[PDB]
Amino acid sequence: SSKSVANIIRKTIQREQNRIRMLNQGLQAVSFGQVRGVRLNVNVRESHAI
Amino acid sequence: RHFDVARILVDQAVRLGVAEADFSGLPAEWLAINDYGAKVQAHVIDTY
Amino acid sequence: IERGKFRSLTLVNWNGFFARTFDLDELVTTLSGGNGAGKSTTMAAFVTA
Numbered sequence: 001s002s003k004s005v006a007n008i009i010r011k012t013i014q015r016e017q018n019r020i021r022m023l024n025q026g027l028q029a030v031s032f033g034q035v036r037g038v039r040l041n042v043n044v045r046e047s048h049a050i
Numbered sequence: 051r052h053f054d055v056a057r058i059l060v061d062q063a064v065r066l067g068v069a070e071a072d073f074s075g076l077p078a079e080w081l082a083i084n085d086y087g088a089k090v091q092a093h094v095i096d097t098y
Numbered sequence: 099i100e101r102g103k104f105r106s107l108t109l110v111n112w113n114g115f116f117a118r119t120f121d122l123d124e125l126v127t128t129l130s131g132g133n134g135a136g137k138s139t140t141m142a143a144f145v146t147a
């Protein structure tokens with residue numbers, strides 16, 4: 001049961017990572033003050049990967 | 051109208067290069083730019 | 099009588115201000131510039147001093 005839980009979590013995490021990273025390319029360099037762009041950083045956490 | 055000119059003029063001038071003296075640590079003086087007591091503080095703009 | 103006055107505010111080696119002295123007015127001083135121009139930074143320098 002624990003193995004199945006871990007596997008499903010990994011699959012869902014990968015799917016959401018891919019979706020968000022693909023979505024990131026939907027922004028086109030907004031020029032606000034000195035900020036030249038905005039981006040989302042999604043990464044599986046190592047403290048949880050362990 | 052003088053004020054409304056000065057501001058605008060400065061806005062146009064500061065887009066053109068920088069002033070190298072601003073790194074010298076020597077404050078600039080308040081040069082009078084008309085009668086009635088109007089003054090301006092800016093180093094010469096050298097580095098375009 | 100003759101209230102004391104802040105006559106100036108000097109930042110040295112601050113972010114964007116290597117050596118900048120502002121001459122505070124006796125009544126009102128007005129920093130003015132677009133976003134990121136560094137006005138809250140100047141007021142932070144004053145407060146920190």
Ligand SMILES: Nc1ncnc2c1ncn2[C@@H]1O[C@H](COP(=O)(O)OP(=O)(O)OP(=O)(O)O)[C@@H](O)[C@H]1O
Pocket residue numbers: 033034113131132133134135136137138139140
């Ligand atoms: N703690 C900080 N670390 C890094 N950069 C900072 C920090 N605080 C401010 N900055 C940057 O310094 C520049 C000036 O910041 P500041 O807050 O002084 O802007 P400002 O001109 O007062 O802005 P606004 O008019 O929009 O309030 C901006 O690029 C801001 O991103």
